[PDB]
Amino acid sequence: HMLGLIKKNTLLGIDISSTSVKLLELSRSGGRYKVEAYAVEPLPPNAVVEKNIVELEGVGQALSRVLVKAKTNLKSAVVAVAGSAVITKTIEMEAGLSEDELENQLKIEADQYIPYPLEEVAIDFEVQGLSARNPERVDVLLAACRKENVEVREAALALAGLTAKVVDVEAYALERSYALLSSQLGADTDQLTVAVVDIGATMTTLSVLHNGRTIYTREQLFGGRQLTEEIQRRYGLSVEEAGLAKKQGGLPDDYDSEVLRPFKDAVVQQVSRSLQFFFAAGQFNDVDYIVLAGGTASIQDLDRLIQQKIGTPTLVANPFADMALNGKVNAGALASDAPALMIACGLALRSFD
Amino acid sequence: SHMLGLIKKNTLLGIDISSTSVKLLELSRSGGRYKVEAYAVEPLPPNAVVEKNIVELEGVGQALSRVLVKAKTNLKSAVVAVAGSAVITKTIEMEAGLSEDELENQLKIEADQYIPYPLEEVAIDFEVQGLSARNPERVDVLLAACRKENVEVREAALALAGLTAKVVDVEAYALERSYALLSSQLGADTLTVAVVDIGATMTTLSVLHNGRTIYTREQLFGGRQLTEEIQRRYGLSVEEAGLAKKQGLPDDYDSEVLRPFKDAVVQQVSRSLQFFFAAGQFNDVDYIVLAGGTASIQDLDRLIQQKIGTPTLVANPFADMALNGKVNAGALASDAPALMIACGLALRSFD
Numbered sequence A: 001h002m003l004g005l006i007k008k009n010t011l012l013g014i015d016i017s018s019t020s021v022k023l024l025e026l027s028r029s030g031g032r033y034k035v036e037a038y039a040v041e042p043l044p045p046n047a048v049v050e051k052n053i054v055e056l057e058g059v060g061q062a063l064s065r066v067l068v069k070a071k072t073n074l075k076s077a078v079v080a081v082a083g084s085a086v087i088t089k090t091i092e093m094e095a096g097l098s099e100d101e102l103e104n105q106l107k108i109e110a111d112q113y114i115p116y117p118l119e120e121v122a123i124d125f126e127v128q129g130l131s132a133r134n135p136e137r138v139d140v141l142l143a144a145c146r147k148e149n150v151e152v153r154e155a156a157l158a159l160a161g162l163t164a165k166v167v168d169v170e171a172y173a174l175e176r177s178y179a180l181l182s183s184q185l186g187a188d189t190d191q192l193t194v195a196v197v198d199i200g201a202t203m204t205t206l207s208v209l210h211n212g213r214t215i216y217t218r219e220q221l222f223g224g225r226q227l228t229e230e231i232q233r234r235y236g237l238s239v240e241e242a243g244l245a246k247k248q249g250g251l252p253d254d255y256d257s258e259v260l261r262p263f264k265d266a267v268v269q270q271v272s273r274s275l276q277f278f279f280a281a282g283q284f285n286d287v288d289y290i291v292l293a294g295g296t297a298s299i300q301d302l303d304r305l306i307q308q309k310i311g312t313p314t315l316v317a318n319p320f321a322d323m324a325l326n327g328k329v330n331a332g333a334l335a336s337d338a339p340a341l342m343i344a345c346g347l348a349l350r351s352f353d
Numbered sequence B: 001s002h003m004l005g006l007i008k009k010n011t012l013l014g015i016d017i018s019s020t021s022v023k024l025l026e027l028s029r030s031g032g033r034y035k036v037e038a039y040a041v042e043p044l045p046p047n048a049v050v051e052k053n054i055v056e057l058e059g060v061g062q063a064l065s066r067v068l069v070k071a072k073t074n075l076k077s078a079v080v081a082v083a084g085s086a087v088i089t090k091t092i093e094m095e096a097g098l099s100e101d102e103l104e105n106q107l108k109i110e111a112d113q114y115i116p117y118p119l120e121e122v123a124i125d126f127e128v129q130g131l132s133a134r135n136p137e138r139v140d141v142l143l144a145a146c147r148k149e150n151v152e153v154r155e156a157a158l159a160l161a162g163l164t165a166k167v168v169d170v171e172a173y174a175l176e177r178s179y180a181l182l183s184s185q186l187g188a189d190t191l192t193v194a195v196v197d198i199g200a201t202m203t204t205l206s207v208l209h210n211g212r213t214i215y216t217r218e219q220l221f222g223g224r225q226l227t228e229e230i231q232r233r234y235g236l237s238v239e240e241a242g243l244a245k246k247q248g249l250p251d252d253y254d255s256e257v258l259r260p261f262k263d264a265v266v267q268q269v270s271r272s273l274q275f276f277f278a279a280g281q282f283n284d285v286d287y288i289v290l291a292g293g294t295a296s297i298q299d300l301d302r303l304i305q306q307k308i309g310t311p312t313l314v315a316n317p318f319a320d321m322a323l324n325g326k327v328n329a330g331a332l333a334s335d336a337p338a339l340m341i342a343c344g345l346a347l348r349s350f351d
């Protein structure tokens, strides 16, 4: 029950988004972490719309291919749902109950506290401690989402021969990987108020963290796909080619002047406005750092541009800066893909919780 | 179900109980970095812990109560350890298709066949390794068992102080955990080292490669032998002698007691370390790490290094760690080599 007579582990960090699937495997010896494997597999179009999986078979195939590229034997994974699909409430329950009695009361009365219909609820709970109002009672934390969100991921992973050991929340994954960034920035958490800007292909999310803890969160429909869509149109290229054009280069001379710079400015506008909301909605007046995450954060000197326009220290996220690397992992490819792997990193970090 | 992590989140006190003292250590984690939140050392009443066994139960709880007050921690959950000598470890072949709880029961019936302890008095930990290569229809299950009394007496002791053992670890595993932090000092992956822990009533030798223990030996030699010589020469109590040893005695001391005793150490070190090269593949140890309270003797590391021609270092797991405000940086450094076990126990929080 309590025996640690055996010394034991790790779980695959699998980030499923609208456009791709990212896999990351970590290990640790003593204090410091090491990257055992990573890979990225693009998704078929419309396989995932917004945050919703639709082509269940499509995601499965991608997960199968991402395992082959990653070359890992691990079959357990941490996946995440969006925080927007999670309802969190604190309620009072009677103290002195077993876990079963506790689960019965919650399963029965879930609908009383959460908007979702009883049959569709997937609820996680945690006893916080004795209630301050009445010592005869305890405060219990509730977090619930529609069961369908969990079940589609189970089914998707199962097709690739993987299992979802933990269903996480994206915001939590971000925190765990942010905590590793400390070195790069400060280092110390030091009440560092940091704006993490995740610029995905279709979605951009601002998350402000105080001393390692998420506070503000908001999301705009801004993304790197708009850059891709512009590259497609000007040069007559498919979505596949446009994405490749951004990293590979090769596009003619007018690209920087006509396409990339206007997109960069749009990125700056989006970041600026997003940051305005946060200062307005709290006691915080400024942030110590801005951290750029997502694939679009790899755009050359995007950090410098944001830095000059806003006046706030801005850097591209690299959680793997102080990490050891497996010989199978290419340092160049990982470094170029580092900001897009913040979620995948945080998911893998759940293994060490 | 158990799958769910819609809610996010637990640190445990490292409680090292030896023959002479109780040592507490509390760690916190920020990303990869470790921070020392609290620590304290409390002497034990004599004959409260003999060898590796707790005899005077209330005496330990009292020491635990007082070590809590000194450390000033709010934590009530802890990790304690049993000696590896009380732990039997073996891999057996079991039937496949049995659930975890199902397996727990069948272990009871089969325990009798493979573990030395009586059925009624055995505590068993197990882990499924995977399918058996001998027969795929069966699975390999790792077993680790100790007499239940070892677990029960420590629970009862912690309970007298209002603490609870969340995990019953093994000393050797704790040493490993703590030793991997050393590597940062030695640089950088630990890659073979011998760890010499010199306690009050006992000295223990262990060797580690790329982060893993390989060898173990022990002897009744310790700093108490030094204390006892001090007691006799100047008619001072064990408390006085131990205090005088750290505080610093008539000039006579250095030549008549201190120097001989160091000589007694280096010989006891020399004999023990010879067997490892004799009983294994490895022919050279890269470094000797001194641990235990007696390892804090000035220039003892250097004296051992010369006589054995092997790089010698005094352990300090907290070298790269951050410190909480209430922790004294100076006192911790002085006590660091004696806190390797307590440190390793606290690290189990993050395991």
Ligand SMILES: Nc1ncnc2c1ncn2[C@@H]1O[C@H](COP(=O)(O)OP(=O)(O)O)[C@@H](O)[C@H]1O
Binding pocket: A016, A017, A018, A019, A020, A199, A200, A201, A202, A203, A224, A225, A228, A243, A246, A247, A293, A294, A295, A296, A297, A298, A299, A336, A340
């Ligand atoms: N090196 C790069 N330079 C510019 N854009 C990139 C680079 N790498 C990836 N991107 C862009 O990032 C977008 C997706 O990033 P990512 O955040 O990983 O996906 P998601 O939005 O699903 O989280 C894609 O539109 C891609 O064009």
Ligand SMILES: Nc1ncnc2c1ncn2[C@@H]1O[C@H](COP(=O)(O)OP(=O)(O)O)[C@@H](O)[C@H]1O
Binding pocket: B017, B018, B019, B020, B021, B198, B199, B200, B201, B202, B223, B224, B227, B242, B245, B246, B291, B292, B293, B294, B295, B296, B297, B334, B338
């Ligand atoms: N600074 C020091 N200088 C010399 N001897 C010390 C010092 N600190 C502790 N000791 C000796 O080390 C012994 C403590 O051993 P320790 O490893 O803490 O106990 P245990 O055997 O329970 O692990 C005491 O007998 C003490 O005499």
Ligand SMILES: [Mg+2]
Binding pocket: A017, A198, A200, A201, A294, A343
């Ligand atoms: Mg994303």
Ligand SMILES: [Mg+2]
Binding pocket: B018, B197, B199, B200, B292
């Ligand atoms: Mg000891």
